[PDB]
Design an enzyme around this catalytic site. Structure first.
Site, PDB file in Angstrom:
ATOM      1  N   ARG A  98       0.852  -1.183   0.000  1.00  0.00           N
ATOM      2  CA  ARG A  98       0.000   0.000   0.000  1.00  0.00           C
ATOM      3  C   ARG A  98       0.888   1.233   0.000  1.00  0.00           C
ATOM      4  NH1 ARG A  98      -2.867   3.123   4.550  1.00  0.00           N
ATOM      5  NH2 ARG A  98      -3.979   4.543   3.137  1.00  0.00           N
TER       6      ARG A  98
ATOM      7  N   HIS B 275      -2.916  11.125   0.128  1.00  0.00           N
ATOM      8  CA  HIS B 275      -2.383  10.919   1.468  1.00  0.00           C
ATOM      9  C   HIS B 275      -1.716  12.202   1.928  1.00  0.00           C
ATOM     10  CE1 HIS B 275      -1.231   7.398   4.313  1.00  0.00           C
ATOM     11  NE2 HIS B 275      -0.984   8.517   4.960  1.00  0.00           N
TER      12      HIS B 275
ATOM     13  N   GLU C  40      -7.719   8.888   5.641  1.00  0.00           N
ATOM     14  CA  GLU C  40      -7.961   9.591   6.905  1.00  0.00           C
ATOM     15  C   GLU C  40      -8.375  11.046   6.727  1.00  0.00           C
ATOM     16  OE1 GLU C  40      -4.747   9.090   9.616  1.00  0.00           O
ATOM     17  OE2 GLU C  40      -5.027   6.915   9.803  1.00  0.00           O
TER      18      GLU C  40
ATOM     19  N   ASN D 264      -8.026   2.008   9.395  1.00  0.00           N
ATOM     20  CA  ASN D 264      -6.760   2.245  10.073  1.00  0.00           C
ATOM     21  C   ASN D 264      -7.044   2.198  11.566  1.00  0.00           C
ATOM     22  OD1 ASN D 264      -5.691   2.673   7.538  1.00  0.00           O
ATOM     23  ND2 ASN D 264      -5.181   4.823   7.901  1.00  0.00           N
TER      24      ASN D 264
ATOM     25  N   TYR E  40      -5.377   2.104  15.488  1.00  0.00           N
ATOM     26  CA  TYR E  40      -4.269   2.296  16.417  1.00  0.00           C
ATOM     27  C   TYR E  40      -4.685   2.232  17.877  1.00  0.00           C
ATOM     28  CZ  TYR E  40      -1.491   3.657  12.413  1.00  0.00           C
ATOM     29  OH  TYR E  40      -0.778   3.662  11.228  1.00  0.00           O
TER      30      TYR E  40
ATOM     31  N   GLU F 246      -3.976   0.061   7.910  1.00  0.00           N
ATOM     32  CA  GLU F 246      -2.844   0.432   8.753  1.00  0.00           C
ATOM     33  C   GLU F 246      -3.058  -0.120  10.151  1.00  0.00           C
ATOM     34  OE1 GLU F 246      -1.820   4.619   8.979  1.00  0.00           O
ATOM     35  OE2 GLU F 246      -2.137   4.873   6.826  1.00  0.00           O
TER      36      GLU F 246
HETATM   37  O1  LIG Z   1       0.807   8.317  13.129  1.00  0.00           O
HETATM   38  C1  LIG Z   1       0.927   7.099  12.398  1.00  0.00           C
HETATM   39  C2  LIG Z   1       0.211   7.079  11.056  1.00  0.00           C
HETATM   40  O2  LIG Z   1      -1.123   7.488  11.320  1.00  0.00           O
HETATM   41  C3  LIG Z   1      -1.993   7.259  10.222  1.00  0.00           C
HETATM   42  O3  LIG Z   1      -3.019   8.053  10.702  1.00  0.00           O
HETATM   43  C4  LIG Z   1      -1.476   7.987   8.961  1.00  0.00           C
HETATM   44  O4  LIG Z   1      -2.155   7.451   7.806  1.00  0.00           O
HETATM   45  C5  LIG Z   1       0.011   7.691   8.757  1.00  0.00           C
HETATM   46  O5  LIG Z   1       0.487   8.526   7.687  1.00  0.00           O
HETATM   47  C6  LIG Z   1       0.702   8.112  10.054  1.00  0.00           C
HETATM   48  O6  LIG Z   1       2.096   7.947   9.886  1.00  0.00           O
END
Ligand SMILES: OC[C@H]1O[C@@H](O)[C@H](O)[C@@H](O)[C@@H]1O
Length: 440
Positions: A74, A118, A163, A290, A292, A349
């Protein structure tokens, strides 16, 4: 235990974070060139001028993907390389570069998953209000058409935006990302024009494509949990969920903007006439998630919008910059599967940042990152068992890179980048992923 045999296994990058070569082959100026060259905006005084030099060294990046046994990559296309003025003539040299790169990926057995936007908006468009202007949505769709006409014979899987919450809210309201404005109304207007650009681009792409395409969008989603069952905390969790997640999911699903958030924003909310909402809800072939972190929310009435603050849990693992909560990945996937119409789903991600260093033996012993991947992959197996139509997983990131306002100082790679010599080396977690994928 076992993933489907045809599951997509990849790693992800973005153009400004890795490419460098910011003035080469006709590239124009992006908002991130302007922003990173503004004193004090980047934590460590770095820029993306060189980054990982992947414009020249993409062959090395392909070697890493092959060494890890991945089957997809990607990456994003830099709009400033393709239409340097934003709206204007094409730069054929930019298209030819990505055409060669795509051929190199396909020659190596790697499926390209391409992100069109992006975050690297051409500066000439920001000079005309950027995402604050509807015209930017129109010219984004023109850029999407151009790229698909030339690469759509070989690339089937495309995402329009990465995002949009970040581009709108961090770039136009909180001022921490490019272009760096600090106005709520402009942030909410930007969120609408991003979504409109997405919808216009989907239609343009289908008309321009030389073969059927699989088109998606990539959203950051944050599962939100109230700290207590009090009315105040539950309401704070709903507001935060609306601010990050539902504001984007609902219009894409054909449900308009969420009424509770329109009421909360009041006069700052954008003017969304129904023609726009129909366009925004153009049918998609997949949705990228994505993931996290979670948000455990407590009411914070004296705080800024959305008047919800995070309640840290010191007992949970923390990385260099985030709290780790793997079970939120299961929760958000089950919510999407049950409550929204998008399918199939990809994790576009997932990854973490640590204070990585090269040890005496030459390796990078990033055990927390290995544990991070293992824990999140286990939650994906649980989601698959529940029937969630998940088709692939991309680690963020292939290599340490320019992490936006944190600069080069925040390392998210599964491969370590020496920013002085540009050498890449696989971290222990990367070898763990290699061996896990091979076992699948
Ligand atoms: O902070 C970590 C990652 O966060 C994601 O929201 C973004 O797509 C990435 O570009 C960023 O590096």
């Amino acid at each position: 235990e076992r993933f489907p045999a045809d599951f997509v296994w990849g790693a992800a990058t973005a153009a400004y974070q890795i490419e460098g070569a910011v003035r080469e082959d006709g590239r124009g100026v992006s908002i991130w060139d302007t922003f990173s060259h503004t004193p004090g905006k980047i934590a460590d005084g770095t820029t993306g001028d060189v980054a990982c030099d992947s414009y020249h060294r993409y062959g090395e990046d392909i070697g890493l993907l092959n060494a890890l046994g991945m089957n997809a990559y990607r990456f994003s296309i830099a709009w400033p390389r393709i239409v340097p003025l934003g709206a204007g003539p094409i730069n054929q040299a930019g298209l030819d570069h990505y055409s060669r790169m795509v051929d190199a990926l396909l020659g190596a057995g790697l499926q390209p998953f391409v992100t069109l936007y992006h975050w690297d908006l051409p500066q000439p468009l920001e000079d005309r209000l950027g995402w604050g202007s509807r015209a930017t949505a129109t010219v984004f769709a023109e850029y999407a058409d151009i790229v698909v006409r030339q690469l759509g014979d070989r690339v089937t899987h495309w995402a329009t935006l990465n995002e949009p919450w970040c581009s709108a809210m961090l770039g136009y309201y909180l001022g921490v990302h490019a272009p760096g404005h600090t106005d709520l109304k402009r942030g909410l207007e930007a969120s609408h024009n991003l979504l409109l650009g997405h919808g216009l681009a989907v239609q343009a792409m289908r008309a321009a494509a030389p073969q059927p395409l699989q088109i998606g969008i990539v959203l950051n989603l944050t599962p939100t949990y109230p700290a207590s069952d009090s009315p105040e905390d539950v309401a704070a969790a709903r507001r935060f969920d609306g601010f990050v997640n539902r504001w984007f999911l609902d219009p894409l699903a054909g449900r308009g903007y969420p009424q509770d958030m329109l009421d909360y924003y009041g006069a700052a909310a954008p003017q969304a006439n129904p023609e726009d909402l129909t366009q925004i809800a153009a049918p998609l072939d997949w949705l990228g998630v994505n993931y996290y972190e979670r948000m455990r929310a407590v009411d914070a009435p004296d705080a800024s919008l959305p008047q919800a603050q995070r309640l840290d849990d010191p007992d949970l693992p923390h990385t260099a910059d985030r709290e780790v909560y793997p079970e939120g990945l299961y929760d958000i996937l089950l919510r999407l599967h049950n409550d929204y119409p998008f399918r199939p789903l990809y994790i576009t991600e997932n990854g973490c940042a640590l204070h990585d260093e090269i040890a005496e033996d030459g390796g990078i012993h990033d055990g927390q990152r290995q544990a991070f991947f293992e824990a999140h992959l286990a939650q994906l197996q649980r989601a698959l068992a529940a029937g969630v139509p998940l088709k692939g997983y991309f680690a963020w990131s292939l290599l340490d890179n320019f992490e936006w306002a944190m600069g080069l100082s925040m390392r998210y790679g599964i491969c370590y980048t020496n920013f002085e010599t540009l050498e890449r080396r696989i971290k222990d977690s990367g070898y763990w992923l290699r061996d896990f994928i091979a076992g699948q």
